[PDB]
Design a protein around this ligand. Structure first.
Ligand SMILES: OCc1ccccc1O[C@@H]1O[C@H](CO)[C@@H](O)[C@H](O)[C@H]1O
Ligand SMILES: OCc1ccccc1O[C@@H]1O[C@H](CO)[C@@H](O)[C@H](O)[C@H]1O
Lengths: 449, 454
């Protein structure tokens, strides 16, 4: 019941919907945009399901106003979107593409008018391909490229943006992309990943400084998919493994940003293969933030891996406890969100928290002009319940963004996996609000109270 | 009779018109990677991403040939070598792969070619020696058919400017490396390990070659066009039926993937049976384009490929494994020295295919000794040359149309995944000072080559 749920949130609570540039925009060669590492990743056989690419996506570059009208119609207060660096500075470094800035200029103006709050993400994984020439994120220069990019974007949009985040999910851009080979640019090398790790942390810090110089009134944050690490058993071995996993998967980012240091045990094992950490780096990385964003979907269950020569954190996947799974295979276990936030606030000195992503893959389509996606509605009801619990416990939860306004390109899964509150038929580009979306609209429309 | 030097005795075994040359490739020697409109190649990316190249060595400086090319040409001249084989950097000519032509890039090679003409050095240009513009990766690189058309336009652009003076042109150097080593084995840029990607690269590079042949003859019909291939001398571990059949599968996969389309207008049958379903679309005119008649072809040879049958269940075609060397003689990069494998390879190729004239376009050895007392005593490299050149002379005597030979490396340079650690040059380069020092093997090769054309 959406109305009893609404009663559990403070009157000024911020409800939003969220989106990413490469996932929805399409128009990949339009108005001066040059390729991103994801264009290359999609088009090389092997990396992405069906060799699906971002060429058309949801055609949001052309349909952006219709999509803003839809958000307004749903009565959702905030919109979180990302900015395509390949549109703004197509070669990473080099000339600014003013037509690229124009698109986000119109977008933000469109939101301003409609009373929709704007939460921009500067980097949601679409690195300009040209920067790979220098080594991509493995090169320190790429952080300075971002520094210039951040300044350029905020100089134009800073007078109107309600909030900005430098990065979305360093874990993905770092390990999943450079150690595990699953995301662009698809590397599997610890040296490359440790380089990307430090350089993305550094770029974050550069972005905070850049944004505050050109747009000092805009609250600056960082969006992280902190993993809810759960040991497989209560053994000493699994307990210690859970901590190693926490340091590597979360601590690699939270510790430099919020404590100004890398995790000690991780440095002990991996430090010799890290790039140069210069004298000022950790102070730049750990500048104070106005907010932070949590992306949460599913727990990370781990067990000790005793295999000789296993690299830190030396763990392996543990089986799910719940038997409820989404259509992408991810375990549904809401309590893990509670224990995660509790853990983070005990361990770190953190600012206000917004849930910047939470949602579920369920692939049902249209019948009778409707989409009966009850399990997605149940997923939302259950996790929002947890957020309300966290509010009751005294945690500074200020808002919530449902992941995915619409069905879109889902990275290595291509278009086969649907996360949207709004269904998209890729043949016709018709948007159909799903039942979960009608429910979320019903909840969000009562805020501010 | 009275004592005679080995090089003089050797020179007598070659016809008077035999062509001796030295060879280089753009990314290995040029440096100046961000000057005059050049944009990154897949090798700039590959070098700078940790894990791909020794020491993360890159091509930013190399031998600084872009700035020292005239000095290097004067060295060729002093050596009395008739021909120079070099490659042209697509990233300098059309920096985004497609898109605007970079006149400054063309100008460098225009001046280079004029400089060779001025010195009486014959020019053999290679259009593609692995430095694909990075921007083309956006479309899928060699996995995308569009890339063949990008090369086509590039080829036509270069030949329109240079065709009035080039003595010969080759479209590609070593399809095997650009294809399997780069897209299946993950050792060369762009470092993929995927059979679908590799088979796409295979067909589109074969197609690009054909496009390049047509393009070059369209704007420069006088210039002899060829293709440079590292054909592998496949040697079975035994005469067992299992090993003989394995050697044939190996030949089809490693050589036939390229020789059959180019010289027979078809892909190898057994290969197609195993891999055909994962190949890209082959359009109606594709094999006809690929199989245009060539004026010459180039053989790159270094070491044999020894194989035995791999009986492991499900092993991917050609399902082979490594067989042991016959010699314990190896170069500093680890490659078996076995010169007679050059003879049997050439025998085999001329029986199996109808081929034009042959030029040995690469042959040489990795030996890493440096300068002592003003000299480089690289006797084992000299011996490598003396022995392999003996085989080449044997081939001439045996009736094969071997028209020339290019020593691989003019100078020490960037050696792909090995970085600057592996030296292949006839000329030593001290990378701190950029000083060139002709090695003893280089002095020997000069003494041989100086007498030609007789
Ligand atoms: O595979 C990406 C991913 C894995 C684990 C945790 C967060 C993740 O990231 C999120 O995943 C979603 C689903 O593909 C994406 O739509 C979002 O853009 C992304 O931020
Ligand atoms: O690993 C490259 C390679 C392997 C097997 C056959 C030919 C090869 O490529 C050759 O190898 C030489 C040495 O690294 C290079 O200098 C030449 O440019 C190249 O054509």
């Amino acid at each position: 019941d959406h109305k009893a749920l609404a009663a559990r949130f403070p009157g000024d609570f911020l409800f939003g919907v969220a989106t990413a540039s490469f996932q929805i925009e399409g128009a990949t060669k339009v108005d001066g945009r040059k390729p991103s590492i994801w264009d290359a990743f999609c088009n090389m056989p092997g990396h992405v399901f069906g060799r699906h690419n971002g060429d058309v996506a949801c055609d949001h570059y052309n349909r952006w106003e219709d999509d803003l009208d839809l958000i307004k119609e749903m009565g959702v207060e905030a919109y979180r979107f990302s900015i395509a660096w390949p549109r703004i500075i197509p070669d990473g470094f080099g000339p600014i593409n003013e037509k690229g800035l124009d698109f986000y200029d119109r977008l933000v103006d469109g939101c301003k008018a409609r009373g929709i709050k704007t939460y921009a993400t500067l980097y949601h994984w679409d690195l300009p391909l040209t920067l790979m020439g220098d080594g991509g994120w493995a090169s320190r220069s790429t952080a300075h490229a971002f520094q210039r990019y951040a300044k350029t974007v905020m100089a134009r949009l800073g007078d109107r943006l309600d909030a900005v985040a430098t990065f979305n999910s360093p874990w993905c851009a770092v390990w999943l992309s450079h150690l595990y080979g699953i995301h662009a640019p698809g590397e599997r090398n610890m040296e490359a990943a440790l380089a990307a790790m430090h350089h993305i942390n550094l770029a974050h810090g550069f972005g905070v400084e850049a944004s505050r110089h050109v747009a000092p009134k805009v609250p600056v944050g960082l969006v992280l998919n902190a993993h809810s690490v759960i040991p497989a058993s209560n053994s000493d071995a699994d307990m210690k493994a859970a901590e190693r996993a926490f340091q590597f998967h979360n601590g690699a980012f939270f510790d430099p940003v919020f404590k100004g240091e890398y995790p000690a045990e991780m440095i002990e094992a991996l430090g010799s293969r890290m790039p140069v950490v210069e004298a000022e780096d950790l102070s730049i990385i750990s500048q104070k933030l106005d907010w932070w964003g949590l992306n949460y979907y599913t727990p990370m269950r781990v067990a000790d891996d005793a295999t000789e020569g296993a690299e830190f954190p030396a763990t392996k996947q543990a089986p799910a406890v719940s038997d409820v799974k989404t259509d992408i295979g991810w375990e549904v276990y809401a309590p893990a969100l509670h224990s995660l936030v509790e853990t983070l606030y005990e361990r770190y000195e953190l600012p206000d928290c917004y849930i910047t992503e939470n949602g579920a893959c369920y692939n049902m389509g249209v019948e009778n002009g409707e989409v009966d996606d009850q399990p997605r509605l149940d997923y939302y009801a259950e996790h929002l319940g947890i957020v309300a619990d966290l509010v009751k416990d005294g945690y500074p939860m200020r808002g919530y963004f449902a992941w995915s306004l619409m069905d879109n390109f889902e990275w290595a899964e291509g278009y086969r996996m649907r996360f949207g509150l709004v269904h998209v038929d890729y043949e016709t580009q018709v948007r159909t609000l799903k039942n979960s979306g009608k429910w979320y609209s019903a909840l969000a429309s009562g805020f501010p109270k």
